[PDB]
Structure 1
Amino acid sequence: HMCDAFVGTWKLVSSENFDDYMKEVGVGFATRKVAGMAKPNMIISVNGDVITIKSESTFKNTEISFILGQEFDEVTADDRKVKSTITLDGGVLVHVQKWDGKSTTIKRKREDDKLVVECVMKGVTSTRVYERA
């Protein structure tokens, strides 16, 4: 029952400062423009200890499956090859991606009927809000 409140199908309803977050990450112009337009569907499911997060969009579809605390390989929407670890900290999913000596942290939290995603790359935060689809 660890992620019960995250499970489901979610749709992006708002975004703030995502272009700047992507600039800090190192995303190029064209990918920032097209990725920034996307209105992804996030589908979160749990089967035993394995959590799956799928993102479906017009630009790219992504999928990760993982066990909490156990590092894995991820290919991001912008085609970075990263080493990721996802943990639960006080009811917040905390996702750290490492690549090329860089790091970004993505936090996912339930707040009211929303799933709030906070993405941080050095000093820059983007906040992305999802509602149930």
Structure 2
Amino acid sequence: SHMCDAFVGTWKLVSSENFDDYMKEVGVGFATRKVAGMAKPNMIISVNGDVITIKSESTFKNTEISFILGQEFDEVTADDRKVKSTITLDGGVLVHVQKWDGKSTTIKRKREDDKLVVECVMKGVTSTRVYERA
């Protein structure tokens, strides 16, 4: 319990850096990159017992994942990859690893001041996405 208290809430994207290049590195095609890159999603994080839910309400694609820390699950990403995901807590950072087609990407989510900072890494390419409370 209380494991993710500081993550819970409704968050809105306020800034992004290098997201197009991250998406390229992931293999996202041109048209999806353009439409995905415009979006300013709402990320809604909640906890009920051991189950964490992360919803994204977006003009591009709505998604919802529910999971237990350390327990692999199936995820269809907003860009339509069918991945196997595992999310753990490492030193207060949510670490989300996605595996598909022999590839891997990691999404880290951390609280920094009044922000929720999302770092997306594919090989040598990082994108930083900053969310504030909605």
Sort the TM-score into its range (normalised by shorter chain). Answer: over 0.9
Secondary structure in 2 matching 1:74: strand
Secondary structure in 2 matching 1:33: helix
Distance 1:102 1:109 in 2: 24
Distance 1:35 1:91 in 2: 28
Q: Gaps spanning 5+ residues in structure 1: where?
A: none
TM-score (norm 1): 1.00
Tell me by how many angstroms 1:25 deviates.
0.1
Tell me by how many angstroms 1:34 deviates.
0.1
Q: Gaps spanning 5+ residues in structure 2: where?
A: none
Residue identity over aligned pairs, in percent, reads 100
Distance 1:18 1:67 in 2: 27
Partner of 1:43: 44
Tell me by how many angstroms 1:91 deviates.
0.1
Secondary structure in 1 matching 2:37: helix
Secondary structure in 2 matching 1:68: coil
Tell me by how many angstroms 1:6 deviates.
0.0
Secondary structure in 2 matching 1:125: strand
Aligned length: 133
Secondary structure in 2 matching 1:23: helix
Tell me by how many angstroms 1:20 deviates.
0.1
Distance 1:28 1:97 in 2: 18
Distance 1:59 1:126 in 2: 18
Partner of 2:116: 115
Partner of 1:74: 75
Tell me by how many angstroms 1:59 deviates.
1.0
Distance 1:43 1:79 in 2: 20
Tell me by how many angstroms 1:115 deviates.
0.1
- Offset from partner CA, 1:57-111 (integer Å, 9 cap, x none): 1110000000000000001000000000000000000000000000000000000
Question: What CA RMSD, in Å, does the superposition of the two structures yield over aligned residues?
Answer: 0.2
TM-score (norm 2): 0.99
Tell me by how many angstroms 1:122 deviates.
0.1
Distance 1:33 1:69 in 2: 33
Tell me by how many angstroms 1:14 deviates.
0.1
Which aligned runs of 4 or more in structure 1 are off by greater than 2 angstroms?
A: none
Tell me by how many angstroms 1:19 deviates.
0.1
